[model samples]
Target: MVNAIRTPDQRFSNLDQYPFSPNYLDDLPGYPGLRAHYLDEGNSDAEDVFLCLHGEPTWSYLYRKMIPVFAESGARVIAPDFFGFGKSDKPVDEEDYTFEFHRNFLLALIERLDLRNITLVVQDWGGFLGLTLPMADPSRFKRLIIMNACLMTDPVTQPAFSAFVTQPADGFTAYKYDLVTPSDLRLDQFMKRWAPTLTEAEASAYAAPFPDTSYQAGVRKFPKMVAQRDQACIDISTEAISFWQNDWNGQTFMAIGMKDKLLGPDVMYPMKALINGCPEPLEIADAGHFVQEFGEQVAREALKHFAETE
Candidate 1:
């Protein structure tokens, strides 16, 4: 396996327009010759760290709204783009990607960074990746904030998510962007509400990671990984849940999006019950799977509160 990091030009050509940041660590190891990319943001002197992980079809851009606030509040934030997504290196061959491989990549990143006092904020596959890191070493994490995400192996798969996997929409990517905003909201309105703080360059920077269909391998593979019950990922998830319940109980919280078709708050009632005595459930009303975008205000408040209380 090669450890040589890709140059800015090799990974992204439009560095001027994209304005690459220095905090990103490239070429993370999960397989031979393939590297992952990750972002570590916020005040280095902060005692606490907010580790945010994104899921399918999205990158660290998902947490762009939340990173600044946490940073300003004296907490460090770390958000990593999974392999084949964001500024991370993309594998030309789709077959090289797998659920276990991504998990191992993240595990390696955390170990290398030596992250501690971690306030884990997980969404979608973020739950799978972030939770697994804690399961590997419970002492490494201090608390967890789950948003529109799942950690259980036996999740109640929604018909919408299943349909997407079986017969993906021709405009699936566009559809995903639309799903995060209210129907009445126009693009300008949506951008103003959620991404108003971002400059034109920053907006372009967020979109720079995925230039075409080939770069979407991680996004396309994510749902399949979740649905493939026979895969080793299922076994790993099952084991993680066992550890969370039997070992780490008092350090978890569920902040759910009620309208999320895939991982709605209703399906997480069991999770709430499991961690009921630890932290209270904070509902993000009218938010869908992309709650970070649709309900950024609520999510930020809830996260800040959770971190403070924990």
Candidate 2:
């Protein structure tokens, strides 16, 4: 059994712009004893389900702006905090957090909740993992709302992915260095640096999930996992490229956080090329990597696109 720790409830009290009630599942298969947290809002039986997945060092809190937008559109919006993030249980050991470990938790949660008619929403690590999910249960997913995120596929097949992976110095390189090198990782500072537009309170909310280094195993491992791609993640991502390129018949709305040096146009344009039928992206010129920071506009635009296309 993996040793894990849960952040105290008080740490999350009165977070700015985050008022959703927490929902949890402690009995998910293969994740015994670890309580996973998610936000399930809007009409529970709504035909459209927006499954919002957050990336590294962030959680369901990232979706606060978009959730209300989606929910008010009369659709069910479910945003989950991956293990070791937000309100979810964090396994103390970094080694316990693997590609499959996180991926399987998502699979289990999706099944446990019986989520269907999903419009998969993703960014950052959320997209790295979330983009590959449709192939697992293709019928359940009907649309995609992609933002500054890409699949971790073979560097040889994707020049943009390859360039980002092999380049010696850049935003990602510096970001990875910051995350892996720090003895006391400060997520608030990190988020502020990357996103830049966040307020003091909003930045502190990002750090609320981890009070100390002991609670950061998942945080530390995410950057390393992206930098050193495992064989399984690569293979799965490669297959997903095929799924998006040929098999996908769903509507897609892509958004690019223009100022995200880490995964900006250089990354997103190539991604747009790979996703068959993905139209021109909504370019948020001032937005950075945490595109969700500007999610209200993106959500409204995405919903409009979906409605017009349908």
Candidate 3:
């Protein structure tokens, strides 16, 4: 990690709808100088692990609604703040936050913690990256709880595998334009409109991580990285699609935020065909891209489905 900046402890105080204790991994093998933050809840020794992964512009805080559902149900839950997004150390250069770096750090996190029999709960960038985990190490994951995120793999996969809606000028073009120079106020307004249910404190918690432009280095780079997919996530997504399409044998549960402009029912429903055992998604007509926003119901419904089937 080069030119990394650690957020101050004072910034993370008493977040609303988020009460889990923070766990740190500052000395993991290859992450020599960088400190990683994650939320570890429930029985550590439990054979089952619910690993929640968030995406761009969000952190482990995104999993607040679903953590208890799995943890209270007797499964260990591990939700990490990727290097730039959460309480984790911020690498000043967007160039440093590459696809491989994030992937390597995540691999180390799971291996160091000895996470097994994992159920991957994913959305947004989480789905983009988390879906590829099994490609790296399949045995670590046993089930998939997919939300309003589709793999940003083969550019063709989007239109070929699921419903195709034209991008707002070229995939995340609007994102780069709007967020390149963003403010707490801009983000707050964005959240209020799209993430309507998020409380002011919860919304502030999202803004808390990026105190200013320097701190927003991670946020600044994420969209460009994903938009310029050819240089970043293609190969991983490529291999991952093959892994799920041909080799993965785990059970899958999907949920769709039908109202999502980016990845909605059209994008998600067809994903059922890509996986080996994925079923129809629990359609949330009112929900948007961050399907996890409606996670309380999504979590319970997923658990119910798993209970009857498993």
Candidate 4:
């Protein structure tokens, strides 16, 4: 079993605009005894489940803007911090963090929680993993809201695309960590610039998960794991491509953050075509990689569209 550490609840308490009560899971079958966190807001009895998955270096907290918009509309929003992010426990070894390691955990969580009618809100790494879920269990998913993300299993710009799966999660972490130790100003400041709208508290919340380098194994390995080109994840991505292209029967909403250098319109447009019935994306020219910064508007417009068809 892999040794892991859980971030103290205290570290999370002071985050801005993040007021939800913490939820814990110490008993996910394969990775038992480790605590993972999730936000289970909205009416438990609500029919549809909005499963918002965060990408690299971010947490379920990314969905805070969209969560209320969905829940208050009588929909259920389920945003989960992956094993190494948000309120979830963190594995300390780089090798311990792998593609299947996360994908399987989420698949288990979906079964354990009995999540169904899922409208997955995906971006960044979330798309790399969440987009593959339906290939194995298509019935459990119902819809998709894609934002500045791509199905990175196959080639897009290069001869092939591991979606930077094996890439380093902290390209900036290592380079800028020296300038600031306690809070890592080198990296956090980039966030301040990326999502300029964030207040001091909100910006601090992103860095809260990483108090020191030891707590950064998960963060450190995310990109490297992608670049590793884990063939299994690639296979899942292939299966997912087929599923989304030919089999997906649910409605899809694509939202674009025009300024995202990593997964901008150049990459996202193909993804829209791959999805069986996805419509034109609601492009937000002003947003960046953390497109959820525009989550409220995306949620509002997506729901409005969903309502029209209903």
Candidate closest to the true structure, highest lDDT: 2
State the C-alpha lDDT per candidate.
Answer: 0.62, 0.91, 0.80, 0.79
The candidate 1 region of ten consecutive residues with least summed lDDT is: 181-190
Give a tens-digit lDDT track for model 4, residues 122-189. 99889888888888888899888998776546454333243333233533333223322334333466
Q: Which pairs of residues collide in candidate 3?
A: none
Model 4 CA lDDT for position 194: 66
Q: What TM-score would candidate 3 get against the native?
A: 0.93
Candidate 1 deviation (Cα RMSD): 6.2
Per-residue lDDT tens digits for candidate 1, residues 148-204, read 665536444333333433333432334445433333423323333334544565455
lDDT of 2 by residue, 169-241 (tens): 7678888887888888898999888878899999999999999999999999998998788899999989999
User: What's the residue-level lDDT of 89 in candidate 2?
Assistant: 93
TM-score of 4: 0.91
TM-score of every model?
0.75, 0.98, 0.93, 0.91
The top-ranked prediction according to TM-score is 2
Arrange candidates, best TM-score first.
2, 3, 4, 1
Model 4 clashes, total count: 12
The Cα RMSD of model 4 versus the native structure comes to 3.5
Model 3 CA deviation exceeding 4 Å by range? 157-166, 169-171, 183-186
Candidate 4 runs further than 4 Å off: 156-187
lDDT score for residue 284 of model 3:
89
Report the lDDT tens digits of candidate 3 across residue range 259-282. Answer: 776677656766777888888778
Q: Tell me how candidate 1 scores on lDDT.
A: 0.62
